[PDB]
Ligand binder design. Structure first.
Ligand SMILES: O=c1ccn([C@@H]2O[C@H](COP(=O)(O)O)[C@@H](O)[C@H]2O)c(=O)[nH]1
Ligand SMILES: [Mn+2]
Ligand SMILES: [Mn+2]
Ligand SMILES: [Zn+2]
Ligand SMILES: [Zn+2]
Length: 297
């Protein structure tokens, strides 16, 4: 439905003060805003993101993806007109793994967003409530599991340069079209995921619970300085004590009792179903098969 139109939103480069005011007015009338950051690649390959180059934004108020050129605009100009927007708790800010992004917004821009919802944490919260799984999943896994969508391939020229790590990559101006298109991809996927995860009676976790859980991550990573102690035991998981407090106890399989999978995924329940040895059907045994014993039918 409306999820199909999200991925065909075109990008608008915002690199002037007039384009910045036109974008702020549009984002002001929004209810949710998907956010992402493209930063300079760091030779140290350390935790903290590099110098912010682009901030990507995609809201439900307009069919467009704003690419704020923070490098050209300078952080000071970009912050002066985006601060209250990011500080407005009445507008939901959507992220996929907000940790290093919130750290960069705090360290480099001096802003701490309000009303944040981390859709990667949202997915892990579902995995925790159903399977007692606290691992974090990548964007593609979440897109396939939640929306049944296989995202298109990222441009390998941009992907190799970023994995290579010799250069800032995102310092060049103007940016090629395949860099601009690469940068606008994540915010489209993020806003799409919110339609499947927010306002859904089939989602077993309340949004307010994941909002409270995300606010803890923001408080931990928006401290106006580089974060040293990570909130999670490993980078690819979610703090279990935070899951127990905000989401509740972890779940498991109602059939066999084991954690890590649900009843629909249980091998033992599937292997234990009666399978007719005479006609192959699942559901009955040979002693009750009408095909083998027509005296029953
Ligand atoms: O009855 C089972 C047991 C495991 N798994 C799946 O196997 C993987 C590893 O689970 P485990 O070996 O840690 O039990 C997970 O994807 C889990 O969902 C099932 O689908 N059903
Ligand atoms: Mn990101
Ligand atoms: Mn991104
Ligand atoms: Zn089971
Ligand atoms: Zn049979």
């Amino acid at each position: 439905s409306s999820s199909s139109m999200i991925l065909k939103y075109p990008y608008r480069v915002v690199d002037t003060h007039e384009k910045l005011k036109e974008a702020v007015t549009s984002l002001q009338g929004a209810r949710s805003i998907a956010l992402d950051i493209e930063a300079f690649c760091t030779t140290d390959q350390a935790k903290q993101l590099g110098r912010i180059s682009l901030v990507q934004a995609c809201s439900d108020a307009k069919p467009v993806v704003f690419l704020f050129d923070v490098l050209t605009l300078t952080p000071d100009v970009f912050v002066k007109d985006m601060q209250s927007l990011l500080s407005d708790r009445e507008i939901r800010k959507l992220f996929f793994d907000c940790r290093r992004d919130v750290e960069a917004l705090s360290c480099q821009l001096g802003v701490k967003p309000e009303g944040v919802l981390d859709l990667q944490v949202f997915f892990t919260a579902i995995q925790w409530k159903l399977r007692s799984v606290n691992r974090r999943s990548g964007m593609g896994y979440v897109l396939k599991s939640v929306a049944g969508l296989t995202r298109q391939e990222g441009d390998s020229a941009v992907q190799t340069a970023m994995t290579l790590g010799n250069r800032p990559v995102w310092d060049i101006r103007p940016l090629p079209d395949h860099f601009l298109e690469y940068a606008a991809g994540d915010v489209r996927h993020i806003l799409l995921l919110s339609n499947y995860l927010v306002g859904n009676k089939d989602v077993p976790v309340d949004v307010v619970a994941v909002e409270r859980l995300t606010a803890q991550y923001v408080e931990h990573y928006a401290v106006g300085k580089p974060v040293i102690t990570e909130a999670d035991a490993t980078p690819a998981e979610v703090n279990r004590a935070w899951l127990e407090r905000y989401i509740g106890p972890g779940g498991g399989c109602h059939f066999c009792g084991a954690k890590g999978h649900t009843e629909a995924e249980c091998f033992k329940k599937q292997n234990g179903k009666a399978k007719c040895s005479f006609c192959g059907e699942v559901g009955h045994t040979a002693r009750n098969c009408f095909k083998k014993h027509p005296q029953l039918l």
